[PDB]
C-alpha cells in the first residue's frame, strides 16, 4: 500500500517480513468450537484491539509467494450470537495491501 514502511513492529519479533499481523501458522492453531476470547488469545487480538466488539474478525496469511493477481489469503472469523466459532472463512485477499 501507500504506507509501505514496515518499520513499526513494536519490538523485534522475527518470523515474517511481510507483516506483523496474524499468519497461516496461527490459523492452523485455532479451531471452530471455541469462543471469541479463545481465538483472540490463540490468534492475537485484531488491530482494533477489541475482538469482543465484533463478530467478524479479519486476519492475514503467512508469507506466501503471491503467484496470482491476488497474493494474500484473508482469514475471516465468523462467530454466532453467543460469541462461539461457527466458521473459519479463509478466502483470497485484496490484490495487494
Curated annotation (Swiss-Prot):
GO cellular component: Bam protein complex; membrane
Keyword Lipid biosynthesis recorded: no
Lipid bilayer topology: Lipid-anchor
Subcellular location: Cell outer membrane
Main location group: membrane
Disruption phenotype: Mutants show minor defects in the assembly of outer membrane proteins.
Assigned keywords, A-Z: Cell outer membrane, Lipoprotein, Membrane, Palmitate, Signal
Biological process according to GO: Gram-negative-bacterium-type cell outer membrane assembly; protein insertion into membrane; response to antibiotic
A single MF term (Gene Ontology): identical protein binding
Superkingdom of the organism of origin: Bacteria
Subunit field text: Part of the Bam complex, which is composed of the outer membrane protein BamA, and four lipoproteins BamB, BamC, BamD and BamE. Forms a subcomplex with BamC and BamD. Monomer in the periplasm, but is able to adopt a dimeric conformation in the cytoplasm. The Bam complex has the shape of a hat, with the BamA beta-barrel crown in the outer membrane and the periplasmic brim formed by the BamA POTRA domains and the 4 lipoproteins. The intact Bam complex can have 2 BamE subunits.
Function: Part of the outer membrane protein assembly complex (Bam), which is involved in assembly and insertion of beta-barrel proteins into the outer membrane. Nonessential member of the complex that stabilizes the interaction between the essential proteins BamA and BamD. May modulate the conformation of BamA, likely through interactions with BamD. Efficient substrate folding and insertion into the outer membrane requires all 5 subunits.
Assigned protein family: Belongs to the BamE family.
Protein name: Outer membrane protein assembly factor BamE
Organism: Escherichia coli (strain K12)
Full-sequence portion shown in this chain: 21 to 113 of 113
